[PDB]
Amino acid sequence: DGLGSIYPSLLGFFSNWPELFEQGRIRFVKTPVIIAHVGKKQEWFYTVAEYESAKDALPKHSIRYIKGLGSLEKSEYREMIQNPVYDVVKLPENWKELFEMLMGDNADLRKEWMSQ
Amino acid sequence: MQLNNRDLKSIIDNEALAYAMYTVENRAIPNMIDGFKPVQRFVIARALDLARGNKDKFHKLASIAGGVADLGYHHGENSAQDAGALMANTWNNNFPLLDGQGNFGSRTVQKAAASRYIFARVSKNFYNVYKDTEYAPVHQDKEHIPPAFYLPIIPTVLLNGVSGIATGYATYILPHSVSSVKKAVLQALQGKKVTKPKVEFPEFRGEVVEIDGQYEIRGTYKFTSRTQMHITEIPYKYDRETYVSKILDPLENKGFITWDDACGEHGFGFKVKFRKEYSLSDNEEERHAKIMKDFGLIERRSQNITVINEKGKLQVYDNVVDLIKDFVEVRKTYVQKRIDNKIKETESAFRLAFAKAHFIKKVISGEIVVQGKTRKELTEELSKIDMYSSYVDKLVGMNIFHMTSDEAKKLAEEAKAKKEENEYWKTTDVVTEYTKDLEEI
Amino acid sequence: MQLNNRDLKSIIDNEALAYAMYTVENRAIPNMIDGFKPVQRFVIARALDLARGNKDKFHKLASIAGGVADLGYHHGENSAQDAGALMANTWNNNFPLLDGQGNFGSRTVQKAAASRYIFARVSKNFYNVYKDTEYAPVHQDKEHIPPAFYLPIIPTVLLNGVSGIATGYATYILPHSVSSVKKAVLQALQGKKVTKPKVEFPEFRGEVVEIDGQYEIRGTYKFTSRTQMHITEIPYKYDRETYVSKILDPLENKGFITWDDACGEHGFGFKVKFRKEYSLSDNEEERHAKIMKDFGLIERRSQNITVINEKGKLQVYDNVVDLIKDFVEVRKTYVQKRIDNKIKETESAFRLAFAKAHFIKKVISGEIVVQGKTRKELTEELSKIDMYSSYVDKLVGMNIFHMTSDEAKKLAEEAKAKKEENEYWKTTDVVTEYTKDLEEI
DNA sequence: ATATATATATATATGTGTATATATACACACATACATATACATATATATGC
DNA sequence: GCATATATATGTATATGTATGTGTGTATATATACACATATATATATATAT
């Protein structure tokens, strides 16, 4: 939901001002979607593909899916804010054609965009 | 303290593409074989888990929404009880799978009911269509307690209409008539000429006519007099308030018509007096077409099929019959697999029944008896016997009233019943059992 | 058709009186025993319903809210899950009733989130204070599937803070401290002079000053300098939002204060720079009185004790020690009932075990012979024996691995094991087991 | 020299999702305050009194 | 030229009577605003033509 819908729409909103992108002041915070108990310790997985690549290699567990911060606990939030992880968002030189290709009202862009 | 440069193209190609394919398969478009959404599979899977005890008990729609995350739902549940609320009607769907309890609605109210008032149970239609669901294909996710897809004997998606809408893609199928789809899959069984099924919408006393891809869903009116008229059926895309605010309210503001309620038990009844400003032709055909266009009793519709196969990708069909025969061939293959598996289990339960019958016949009369010995060496002594082997664990935990001679014959006669079921299911095929499945209706 | 005159005295003194009765006795009040309102009794009752299978699995609040109407609930489930959200705090409650998993707020925020992100399960402290629940007094209504109340060793009404509000009456009780109430029920068990427990708040560094039937809950503050200010604790009825909105903002738009945040591991850390046109008193006691008058760090609270008893009727009290003593004298009768009933069943169990052990000692080359004879013959000949008077159904439901020597000694040692349990629960009384279940903290 | 034939992007709208909020009754028995006014003491002063 | 006296005006400090709570959740219902697209529809803007 978040990183697929409110992320690229607000990046298309932010595309009017690239100066804060080359100032490096926009920082995405990578957030976990699965917290898994293995043995005693926990493991964090940010996206579903990160879990699904490492699902078979990891042993028997008890997972908890994370829908958002409402399922995250106190110590988990204090760890991810006092030791945060940022993606630095850099606009390319062809940001306008990407934002028109992915945010324009033509559905055909979304048709052969997914066909590759 | 991590900082990584993140470019927009790989952002698109990972997560926007993931959002696109997620909206395609896991949010909007059902699989072509059974016609269920994944959230809809969660709804009927929770219906199975709720009605494991009794079929006839009525569960709350909050109860069908309650324990959903343990079966693999991970998203907003409010869409799950609203999707459950948009299926158990008698009026939007020809073919319900859930008996309702409460005002789920009629055609006169388009709104679904709340999650605080209506009970529901599963219908008999689940026990008419959806069979051998222990042989459903296991989903790749272990957390996915519902299967990869369910097991229908019919193309269900044609029976109630599905509007799927996702990232750059659209699809719409429309409801049909039960005997038309029934004779269509009867012809598709026998390799005959398959007729495209007749379109039926429930609680609709008008008709739907197919004109060059367009479908015209017709509202009905009748001349009460020269200036008086009665609308008796309207198209379903207009509700009561929608026909009022889209037709009737933008006709009394201009002083054209005058309307009042006459909604009987059949449905959408209105009575309209034509004013003197709204003039009508003497010839009835252009007057009829003028009234038919002005009152909006035409519902135009267009079709789109972008549906999902069993291989996890898209497939576009032009018509109904190709999807029908693809359903027929995949149903023939999986019914052949399930009867081969039944052969495997029918011979296993034969082997266990003959083993327990011969074991009881030697326990009653023979040297095979237990008397203050060591359970373990007794089980090893049974493990010496080749046809007492691999069944020793439940034999020590087996009751003493089989030791009476009333049940020593009973085990034998039930083994004979297994015999007749074993070489009864050694001779059956796909086509006669699925013929039995179609004549169950 | 019944055109009946229903007069207003009849309307009030039947219908509104029953509505008032429902508010005062089945909506608002917690009993002095369990400390639970009936919707709380519904919440922990369905928590026990979903506690089976594992005591460490986490469950959805909507999974409780689904089938709460099975137990006799006939209202909206949203109030029930918000009630369970309050008992999911462990900051508004000193005593943790349920272990939880999700975002539950802090001191600084009070509105709990919706059910859609929240997992809950039974806490261990339930099992510390609630035990032996099959002896709970079954409610007079048949579809009231939970009992009247449950079995705590403690009055839980005084542990977490009760505001009880209904038609006419109102009541309020502050929380307390675990060691204080533990030594209080020691001293009230022993019959000595009973000490008042200390009122405790969780996660809270303020001070409760007890003067003239009056509780002054005092937030903390410190003069870091003459002008610069640090309030570290605010009183308990206020959170960070209303301390900003009703204290920090109205003095901030008057040219006297400029507030900022300095929180941390503890909340409510406000660093306030006073302005130069606001007077700092060199009289420090006048400074203290004026900072109490303006900043409002002293919250004064008066309790109110009206309760429904064990008999179902209203009782007005003024002291908490009388509630402890009433709890003890009410509880000891049902403890003695449990002791006598437990003696009855433990004896029935010992005579059952000795009967089945001496049965098996009369089967293994014994006079009780099973082969060659039918079911009815053995049921009649064991029914004529007085020491198999009414047990022969589970003798016949018994299976053949109760034939060896090792099981015969097992039945003998388990018969003498529940014999010594029979004598051990036969000797004891109320007081020493109440001491034991108190010291199992 | 404006009437009309016609063409094309406006308005729902469908279902799915994903998230908000809001008016009220309940009642004590105080809690904080909202001004608030009000009556009375005393000060000075000035203008009378001498 | 100076005693003086009392008068009223304004601090002031308390004590009145109200006024607003919201308390703290339970309880009842309802509303909100967005993203995903084709399919009509409609309505009015321009050309032309005599």
CSV table of C-alpha atoms (C1' of nucleotides) in Angstrom, one decimal, chain C residues 165-168 214 293 298 300-302 304, chain D residues 18-20 26-33:
chain,number,residue,atom,x,y,z
C,165,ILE,CA,-21.9,5.4,35.4
C,166,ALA,CA,-25.6,4.5,35.0
C,167,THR,CA,-29.1,5.9,35.6
C,168,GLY,CA,-29.1,7.7,39.0
C,214,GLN,CA,-9.1,13.7,48.9
C,293,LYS,CA,-3.1,27.6,40.5
C,298,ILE,CA,-2.4,19.1,41.5
C,300,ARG,CA,-7.8,16.4,43.3
C,301,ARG,CA,-10.0,13.3,43.2
C,302,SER,CA,-12.7,12.0,45.6
C,304,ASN,CA,-17.3,7.0,45.4
D,18,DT,C1',-7.6,2.7,2.9
D,19,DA,C1',-8.2,5.5,5.9
D,20,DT,C1',-10.6,9.4,8.7
D,26,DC,C1',-25.5,8.8,30.9
D,27,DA,C1',-23.9,12.0,36.6
D,28,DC,C1',-21.9,13.0,40.2
D,29,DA,C1',-20.2,16.0,43.5
D,30,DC,C1',-16.5,18.0,42.7
D,31,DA,C1',-12.6,20.9,39.6
D,32,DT,C1',-11.3,24.7,37.9
D,33,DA,C1',-12.5,28.8,37.0
